[PDB]
Amino acid sequence: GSSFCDSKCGVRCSKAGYQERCLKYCGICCEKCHCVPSGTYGNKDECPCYRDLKNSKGNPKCP
Template sequence: MAKLVCAFLFMLVTSFVIQDVYAGGEGSLKPEECSAACDVRCSATMYKKACLTYCNYCCAKCLCVPSGTYGHKEECPCYANLKTHEGGPKCP
């Protein structure tokens, strides 16, 4: 009976770990969806190449991109909290 309980608990814990891995970090985006989300985020800037570079980097780490072209960083705290070496915001 103890082996059955241990096996059940192992399967339960494993399922939570697998769900967490597939859900990504903080956000619900899949890594392959970052490019499209960053295209929207960077659509209004004149520095498109730099914006896309940093947005895609941040999205890969956080699996989240705030909506719109500016602001709304409260939607993705991980995205908002990534900083440069100087302490400024890393993500557009």
């Protein structure tokens, strides 16, 4: 992503301790989705694109 989403995901991750990797992933998940919710869980409302994100175990491929 760019600096435009840097603020979107930047929020999604901050108190993760390793957001460094989050911002990385989210950044991509933000590139595929093209949108990201503002907040740490419970904000998906804005963009559930992150909530729908599910893997084989239905888990969020992203952080």
